[PDB]
Amino acid sequence: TVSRATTNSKTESNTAGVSVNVGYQNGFTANVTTNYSHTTDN
Amino acid sequence: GDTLSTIKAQENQIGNNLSPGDTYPKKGLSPLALNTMDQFSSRLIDQ
């Protein structure tokens, strides 16, 4: 019967499936993620 | 061919809104419970 406190983040599972891909293509100053969650997912 | 059981949907099982091509629950989420049998009686349930 063990208890541990936790912390919920709103978009910590939407930026996880991101590859770093140290190099960038033409003008793309951002990245893409395999999946995509909203803040309805803790 | 045979019927195991025919079940309605309950409060926890109902769906508020389902767009065309959408799903309940929506795409990235998990499936549904299927455990209620409307009066909250825990639907019971060779071959």
Give the method used: X-ray
Amino acid at B47: Q
Phi, psi for A33 (deg, rounded to 5): -125, 140
Please give the residue of chain B at the shortest CA–CA distance from A13: B28
Q: Which of A:6-25 have CB within 8 Å of B?
A: none
A13 by Cβ neighbours in 10 Å (0-12 / 13-18 / 19+) ranks as: middle
Cβ–Cβ under 8 Å, residues A38 and A14: yes
